[PDB]
Amino acid sequence: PTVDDILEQVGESGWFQKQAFLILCLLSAAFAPICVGIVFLGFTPDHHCCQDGWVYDTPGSSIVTEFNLVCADSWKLDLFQSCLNAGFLFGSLGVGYFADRFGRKLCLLGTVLVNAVSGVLMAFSPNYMSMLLFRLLQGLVSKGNWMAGYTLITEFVGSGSRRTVAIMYQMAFTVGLVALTGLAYALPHWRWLQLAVSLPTFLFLLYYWCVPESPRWLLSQKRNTEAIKIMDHIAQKNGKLPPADLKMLSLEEDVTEKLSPSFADLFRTPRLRKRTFILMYLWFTDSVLYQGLILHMGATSGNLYLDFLYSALVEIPGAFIALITIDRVGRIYPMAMSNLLAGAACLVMIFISPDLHWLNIIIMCVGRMGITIAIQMICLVNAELYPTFVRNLGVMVCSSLCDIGGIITPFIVFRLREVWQALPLILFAVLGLLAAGVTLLLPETKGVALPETMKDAENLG
Template identity: 50%
Template sequence: MAFFVLCLLSAAFTPIYVGIVFLGFIPEHHCQSPGVAQLRNRCDWSLEEELNYTLPKGETHGDAFTSQCKRYDVDWNTTELNCINPLDFSTTYRNRSSIPLTACQDGWLYDFPGSSIVTEFNLVCEDAWKLDLFQSCVNVGFFVGSISIGYMADRFGRKRCLLITIVINSISGVLMAFAPSYTWTVVFRLIQGLVSKGGWLTGYILITEFVGLSYRRTVGIVYQVAFTVGLLVLTAVAYAIPHWRWLQLAVTLPNFFFLLYYWCLPESPRWLIAQRENDKALKIIKRIAKGNRKKLPPSMQDLQSEEEMGDKPIPLFLDLVRTPQIRKHTLILMYSW
């Protein structure tokens, strides 16, 4: 049971890790030019004809950036324009390439029926770097959160730390869906990054500490497979909900159900033993054995009492390199990541 519910947590982590693909979708776009809509209606142009007549192209400025981020510096409201070739300025310009261009001063038009943070906050052209910043903040949060929350899980317990990350992740995810500006969107996404990766790693630790050494590889792989299943589910949900705010709500609200872990998920017995709380660990081990219809090994009955074990150890980062064996494992994991 504990293994199954933690796999759900792994699947729910997907929208934060790769959600930028849908939340930050960049559709085809071009500058909005005042007067073009009226001219299109007067001339009864199709969309293809409108783009062909009004978008910059040619030998000089025919690249994609120019057609998306520049527009002709032309007054489309003038009565001199004709419907067959509105840019026929033979008396003024030799050809299209000689017509001056200007920036998209009146916004953009997007060829997309839904919405994304790109279309809502116009994160294109000169502001395209803001989309990269959005995802970079998540990755910075992953890095900082993995270190700090990993320490907290060692210091205060896996279950307590996991529940705290779930609460913060859920609340910040909902606030992001209602963020009034790009800045607040980045702030709430950064908070999600700070807690979500650390929470996912805490779930991974719990799964591996619930089972024996011979099963750790199997449960670790299945935990990763659950993440892959989350990718498939996210794709289906994003296809059904093309608006980023509703999509953000749809993938965030289920996280509140993980607060039920408080009642259905036990603390890690291995962590309790490491903290000299053997009485609590033994109770959990007996409950797990009873649920799995297994007989408790005699070695488990001989756990020393808390008084005999001495003071509780305080985890330190130095422990990662204290002995040759753990130092080797730490360096291998750092290289792998």
């Protein structure tokens, strides 16, 4: 009588779960401005390049118009993204035990309050060093918020709807990007845009007090009283009678009362070590090949609004395709096919002359669908292939190996565009195709109802 059976008897997609998913959807739209937002507000309109300073003629005011970073400190924007991505690295190494042991829901609430305060302080920051440190904190806190929220969603949802609710969460992320574009068009000033982004965070915390904790992680602490309380509250919420308390409670005496995120037992079991290595390779791929592809995309009209509108309308067809095909053939074959398609798209620009009609749109479309389907696979698979005391140690393969991609892709492309114009495409295609062909074949399996039964990490092998 695992908690999934209790949720099934109480209704996995009841009204209470609907409002909880709405609340964390409101959280999801608050994560896009942290990562995607920069291309809008940190965008130089024009540069005059004695010099005698530089003046940009545009009604909007970006970060570089107000800090004068056009020529003397042009690399500061790269330094700014490097500092944000090092914030992601600091989060990946930091919010583990510090994100679980103090109370998972309470940690999420404290961090979302911290994010609100730090964003408001970014709105009123009349310097640069404080701005950089605050962006470090913003990156760390926002990554922690989004991963904790997503894993909480895949914890509440019972077996049979994890794919649906997670893919709807990613659709909410894409809708957050679309709303970012809309609010960007609403007013070009970065200050008011940041202040308007910070208000969904208030709307989150204001109503986030009533959301309960994760029942399974709470059961992992051998505290089943309030766990049974919250399960019966959920059951009575969506018009259902409570189940048997003894069946609902699972003692699981072999489980440690506290958590010990393994820094050395990850490689103890060969299945877990192999899964972690495969996910490391796959994650590196993903942002690697990605910002790579984005960079290789042509100049979109407008370059600040229609660029985002065209980039965001890619995901939603991909999200719907994933929703349709993720269960009929499992969560391995569709994403493997998408990655092979992305590799073939990367390899086709080299041997085919660009003068052919519609070649640019064909390659951009195929690559992008491939590395949207890859991302909406890998997030769900990393969430599924880790128990509750390993999922927060499972964020590191998500974020401590995508951070290296985000840091290093500008340098790799900067060297590649000089050494050989045909070099970066061959490198990206070779690494992506070889990795996604050898790997992503058997990273355990899919369709497993119990991810944190103390035997999920070993029985699948």
